[PDB]
Amino acid sequence: KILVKHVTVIGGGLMGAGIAQVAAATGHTVVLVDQTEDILAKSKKGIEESLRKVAKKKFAENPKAGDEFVEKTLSSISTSTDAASVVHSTDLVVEAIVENLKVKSELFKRLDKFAAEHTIFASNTSSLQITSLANATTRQDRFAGLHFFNPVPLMKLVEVVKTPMTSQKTLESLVDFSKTLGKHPVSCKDTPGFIVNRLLVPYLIEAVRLYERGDASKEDIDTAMKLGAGYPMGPFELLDYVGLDTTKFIIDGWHEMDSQNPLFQPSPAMNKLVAENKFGKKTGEGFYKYK
Amino acid sequence: KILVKHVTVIGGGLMGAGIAQVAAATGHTVVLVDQTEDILAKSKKGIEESLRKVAKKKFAENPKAGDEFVEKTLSSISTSTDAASVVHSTDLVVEAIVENLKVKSELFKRLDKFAAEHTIFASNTSSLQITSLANATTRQDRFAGLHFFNPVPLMKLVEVVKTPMTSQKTLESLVDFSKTLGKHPVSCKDTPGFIVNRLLVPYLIEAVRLYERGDASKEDIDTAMKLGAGYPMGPFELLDYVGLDTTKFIIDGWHEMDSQNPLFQPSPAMNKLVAENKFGKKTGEGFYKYK
Ligand SMILES: NC(=O)c1ccc[n+]([C@@H]2O[C@H](COP(=O)([O-])OP(=O)(O)OC[C@H]3O[C@@H](n4cnc5c(N)ncnc54)[C@H](O)[C@@H]3O)[C@@H](O)[C@H]2O)c1
C-alpha cells in the first residue's frame, strides 16, 4: 500500500476547508486549491478562526500551547490557484468542489494527466456516482469516494465509497489515512446515498409527508422523535440544519434515477420553502424561523 | 373535564408495571390487574426494586426518605384478578395486555358495562386500530390511545392517539394526566404507527434491505448511523433489542392494511430469522449473537 503524507485538497469551502484543517492538525502536508487567490485568502482565514475555537477547548488549561497549535498547524497548509502544478508530488487528491458532474469530470480528467502514478483520487460527492468520475480517468483502480460529514472537524464518520474498479491497495491506504485523521471509516458500495444519507433522507421526507397529511404537527413530530427515539434533533430541525435546498437537490436527483418510487416523490410543502428562499438556518428560515 | 385521580392498569407486564409504577409514584392511586396471583405478585415485587433504583442511587441529598417513599408509593397500588370488580370506581382504565385484537377487544366490551360513566378508556396498543377497539364499546367519545415507551419510568414521551370519535373533554383529560406523570404528550390521529414507530420502523427495515441488497455490512450500517446520524443504537442493534417478532408483527399488520406501499413490504431476511426463533436479545440471537 501507500502512506498518505502529502494531501491536495481542491475546493476550499465548507467541506474542503474542513478536510484541510483536519488533515493538517494530524500532521499532513496540505495544499489547498481553489479558484481565486482571494477565495483562498478567506478560506484560510476561516480555517484559522475554526482552529482557534478548537484550541480554546483542547488547550483550555494553557493558551500558549493553544496558540502554538494554531500556528504550527496552519503553517502546514499552503495554497494554489492551479492544482495542475502541485499534484505531480501529492499522495492524495481530495476533491470537494461544486456538486456538478460536468465540472468534476473535467477536473479529474485533467488532473489524471499530471498527478503521479501512485496518487489516489477521491471525491467527496454526496450525490454523484463515484463510478462516473472514476471513468473520467484511466486511474480507476486508484479512485474512490471519501465522503465526509459536516462539520468535518466534529464528525468522526467517513464513508469510503468503492467502485467495482477500486483496488484493495487503494482502500487500505484510504482507511489508514482516515484513521490518522482521527475518523472512523465504514466500507460502502457506489450506490445512491451510500449508507447514511440513503437511510437518513428518505426518513426526513416521510416526516414531512406525515406532516402534510395533517396526522400530526411539526413541533410534536420533533419532540416525538427526540424523546421517544432518542434522536439528537427532530426531523424538522434537522432539515433546517442541513438545509432544505441541499436536501431537496439530493432527493430530486434520486427521484429521477427512479421516478416510480414512492420514497422519492417531491414533498410539495418542501418545494414551498425552497422556491421562497427559506432554505433553513443558512437563511434564517425553513420549517422554522431562526433569529 | 375529569382530573384523573384513580387509575386502573390492566396488565402487569413490561409496560403495565411501568405505568402502574410511574402513576402511583405521581400521587395517583393505582390498581394492578392480571390473570394469575403468581403474576400480580412478581409485577409488584419488580416494581419495588425499580422504585429503589430510583431511590437507593436516586434522591442524592437525603437517602433516608427512600424505604419510606418506596413504601408510600408501593403502598398505594392495590391488586385484583378481576377488573370487573374494580372499574366500578376508577376514572381511567389503561390497558396493556397481550397484543391481540380479539382478546383486547372482548375485555373492553365487558368492562364497558361494569365501568363508571366519567371513566376513560385508553389502550397502549402499538399495532391495532384504536377505532376498532373503541367500537367494542359504546363509550367511543371516552376511548383513546395512550402510548408509552419502554421503560415507562424513564422514557418521557407518550403519544395521545385520538379517534375521530374521541372527545375534546377526553383528550385534555389525558393530556393533563400525562403531564402530571412528568411525561410529555404529543397528539396524533389513529393512523398506523402513530408518530414514532411510523417514522422509526420503516427505516429499520430499509436498513435491513440495504444489507440484503449486499451494499454494506450490518456492522458498518450500525457504526454509520451511530456516528453519522447520532443515533444511540445502530438499526440492527436496536432491532435485536426490540425483538424481530415484535417488529415483524407490526410490519405485516400495517402491510395488510396497505399492501401496495413498499415501505411495509416485509424483509425476507427478517422472516428467515424469526422463522427459526432468532428474535434478538430475548433469545440471545437476532442479527447478532449474545453469549
Ligand atoms: N456541505 C455538505 O452538506 C456536504 C457534505 C458532504 C459532501 N458534500 C460534497 O462536497 C462538495 C462541495 O460541497 P461544499 O459544501 O464544500 O461546497 P461549497 O459550495 O461550500 O464550496 C465549493 C468550493 O469549490 C470551489 N470550486 C468550484 N468549482 C471549482 C473548480 N472547477 N476548481 C476548483 N475549485 C472549484 C469554489 O470556489 C468553492 O470555494 C460537493 O461535491 C458535495 O456533494 C457536501
Ligand SMILES: NC(=O)c1ccc[n+]([C@@H]2O[C@H](COP(=O)([O-])OP(=O)(O)OC[C@H]3O[C@@H](n4cnc5c(N)ncnc54)[C@H](O)[C@@H]3O)[C@@H](O)[C@H]2O)c1
Ligand atoms: N413492550 C413494548 O415495547 C411496548 C411499547 C408500547 C406499547 N406496547 C403494547 O403493550 C401491550 C403489552 O405489551 P407488554 O410488552 O407490556 O407485554 P407483557 O406480556 O409484558 O404484559 C402484558 C401483561 O398482560 C397480561 N395478560 C394477558 N392476557 C390478559 C387478559 N386476558 N387479562 C388480563 N391480563 C392479561 C399478562 O399476563 C402480562 O403480564 C401490547 O398491546 C403492546 O402492543 C408494548
